């Protein structure tokens, strides 16, 4: 069955670094443009990261521009997502989402910065 598995979540201190990993089964990594969303208490869920096909062409939100890293393991159809210079306000639940048809929502992981 097609499913998305996310790992690497945990507790990190202020100014630390983290490496989340989202792996997909049943379809290749280059088939669709991966998306990364975050949800925090407040208004509603918000989008943080997205990389499209035909080259990298990385796009980041203004609040998170220049501080996150995204890499692709094409041989193992996985996406690695690196947090650097985290702040306590960055605490949230993270989702990795892809499209092969109807919208697919991952379980996500909770990240808190102290």
């Amino acid at each position: 069955q097609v499913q998305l598995v996310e790992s690497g979540g945990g507790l990190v201190q202020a100014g630390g670094s983290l490496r989340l990993s989202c792996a997909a089964s049943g379809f290749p990594v280059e088939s669709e443009n991966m998306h990364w969303y975050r949800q925090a208490p407040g208004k509603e869920r918000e989008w943080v990261a997205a990389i499209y096909s035909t080259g990298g062409w990385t796009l980041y939100a203004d609040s998170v521009k220049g501080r996150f890293t995204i890499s692709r393991d094409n041989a193992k159809n996985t996406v690695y997502l690196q947090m650097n210079s985290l702040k306590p306000e960055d605490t949230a639940v993270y989702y990795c989402a892809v499209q092969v048809g109807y919208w697919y929502e991952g379980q996500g992981t909770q990240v808190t910065v102290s």
């Binding site: 969303y37 509603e44 869920r45 918000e46 989008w47 997205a50 499209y52 796009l59 919208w103």
Partner: protein
């Protein structure tokens, strides 16, 4: 020609109609014959938390009618950055969200 745009962009999709997106993405010729069929897709193209799968050109250097520009090379508006993100140059693609 099938595509997805925003609300006010419907007016810009017309022959002889000016506009930033119409002049940068898709323009109809002055002697255009034919037409546009636009329908709302709030239940299909809109997702909670923001849908960022639709892109449009923002910065570019003219464009002929019925011309396709798949290349998204960086645009220099003035010391050249030499294809590096920073000052005097910005990414030409923006997401509707």
């Amino acid at each position: 020609d099938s595509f997805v745009i925003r609300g006010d962009e419907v007016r810009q999709i017309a022959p002889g109609q000016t506009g930033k997106i119409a002049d940068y993405n898709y323009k109809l010729p002055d002697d255009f014959t034919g037409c546009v069929i636009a329908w709302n897709s709030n239940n299909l193209d809109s997702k909670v938390g923001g849908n960022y799968n639709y892109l449009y050109r923002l910065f570019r250097k003219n464009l002929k009618p019925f011309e396709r520009d798949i290349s998204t090379e960086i645009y220099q508006a003035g010391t050249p950055c030499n294809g590096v993100e920073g000052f005097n140059c910005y990414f030409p693609l923006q997401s509707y969200g």
